[PDB]
Amino acid sequence: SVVLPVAKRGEDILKLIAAPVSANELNSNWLYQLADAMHATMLERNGVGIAAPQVYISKRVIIVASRPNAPEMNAVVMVNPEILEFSSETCLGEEGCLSVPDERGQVERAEMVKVKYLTLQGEAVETIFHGFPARIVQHEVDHLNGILFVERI
Amino acid sequence: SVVLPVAKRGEDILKLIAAPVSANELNSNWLYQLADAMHATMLERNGVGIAAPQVYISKRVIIVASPEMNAVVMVNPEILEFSSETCLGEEGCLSVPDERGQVERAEMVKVKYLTLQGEAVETIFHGFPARIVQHEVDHLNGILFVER
Ligand SMILES: O=C(O)C[C@@H](Cc1ccccc1)C(=O)SCC(=O)c1ccccc1
Ligand SMILES: O=C(O)C[C@@H](Cc1ccccc1)C(=O)SCC(=O)c1ccccc1
Ligand SMILES: [Zn+2]
Numbered sequence: 001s002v003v004l005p006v007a008k009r010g011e012d013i014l015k016l017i018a019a020p021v022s023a024n025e026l027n028s029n030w031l032y033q034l035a036d037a038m039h040a041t042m043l044e045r046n047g048v049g050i051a052a053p054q055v056y057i058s059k060r061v062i063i064v065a066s067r068p069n070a071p072e073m074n075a076v077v078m079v080n081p082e083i084l085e086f087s088s089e090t091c092l093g094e095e096g097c098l099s100v101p102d103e104r105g106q107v108e109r110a111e112m113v114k115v116k117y118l119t120l121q122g123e124a125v126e127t128i129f130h131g132f133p134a135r136i137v138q139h140e141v142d143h144l145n146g147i148l149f150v151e152r153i
Numbered sequence: 154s155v156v157l158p159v160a161k162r163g164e165d166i167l168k169l170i171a172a173p174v175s176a177n178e179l180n181s182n183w184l185y186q187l188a189d190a191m192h193a194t195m196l197e198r199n200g201v202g203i204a205a206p207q208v209y210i211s212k213r214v215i216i217v218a219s220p221e222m223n224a225v226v227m228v229n230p231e232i233l234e235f236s237s238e239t240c241l242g243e244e245g246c247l248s249v250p251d252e253r254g255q256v257e258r259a260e261m262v263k264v265k266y267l268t269l270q271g272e273a274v275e276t277i278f279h280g281f282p283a284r285i286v287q288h289e290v291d292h293l294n295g296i297l298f299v300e301r
């Protein structure tokens with residue numbers, strides 16, 4: 001397991017729209033090793049999520065791994081995630097970011113999101129996230145779209 | 154071996170300063186799989202070089218693989234020395250398809266770089282490989298050959 005360097009706020013890599021993962025990357029040692037190194041980076045910093053741009057990889061891969069301080073959730077790796085629907089109900093919750101290590105704040109998020117994504121093997125999954133996990137999905141997708149949580153306060 | 158999608162001219166990824174590879178990443182499966190995907194992408198495109206930014210990886214990793222030579226992967230390459238002697242050669246670019254142009258390059262360059270294992274090494278290139286080294290370093294610094 002490798003801990004990768006993390007991009008900080010002010011770095012341009014964090015403001016791009018990340019490129020989708022191609023079909024021939026699915027089920028590849030390349031994609032497993034990218035996700036493993038992202039997972040290790042997230043755990044090193046006690047994060048609950050991570051997005052490939054934060055480790056200088058402009059690709060649509062995220063990890064969501066909730067814990068209470070809310071489910072205790074083992075990391076789920078999402079390739080090419082797409083939020084199909086944001087709920088009408090909207091709640092404010094505390095967020096931090098590995099790319100903004102000095103600040104936390106309250107961000108308004110959809111209470112639930114319907115998310116479609118590919119596993120590392122390339123299986124299509126659709127799941128509805130609620131609560132803290134929903135906030136983490138919305139945060140990580142914002143990283144893929146060049147958006148930091150401080151821009152949403 | 155994976156062929157990676159290649160960013161084209163006008164994508165902002167090609168305009169950044171790529172980040173140095175960390176000590177953590179040297180001699181890792183991660184870094185070997187990155188060099189292998191980059192190598193495969195270069196071969197499938199009939200390239201003679203490639204830089205990580207071209208496959209949406211903002212890291213300082215290049216491959217030089219010309220005459221004939223065995224492919225060299227360079228981590229955190231730096232040009233330490235170059236000839237006043239300039240030459241002009243035709244260049245193209247995996248990221249600027251169906252564009253060809255004459256570019257002035259140093260005829261000789263000495264490059265310090267790390268191996269995939271993390272050993273500090275120096276090498277001198279002449280002629281076509283020297284042109285390729287300079288083109289790949291330009292990609293790490295957000296420069297496309299069309300600007301030269
Ligand atoms: O994607 C990141 O940048 C990591 C991040 C994700 C996140 C945390 C909280 C809400 C949305 C997204 C973190 O893991 S930051 C530190 C953290 O673990 C945490 C922050 C606030 C509350 C609880 C935990
Ligand atoms: O964009 C790249 O880095 C790939 C590139 C490298 C390069 C070629 C020539 C001079 C400097 C750098 C290419 O391989 S371009 C397309 C190509 O296949 C080619 C170009 C010239 C000679 C032989 C092949
Ligand atoms: Zn974040």
Ligand SMILES: [Zn+2]
Pocket residue numbers: 245246247248288292
């Ligand atoms: Zn090029």
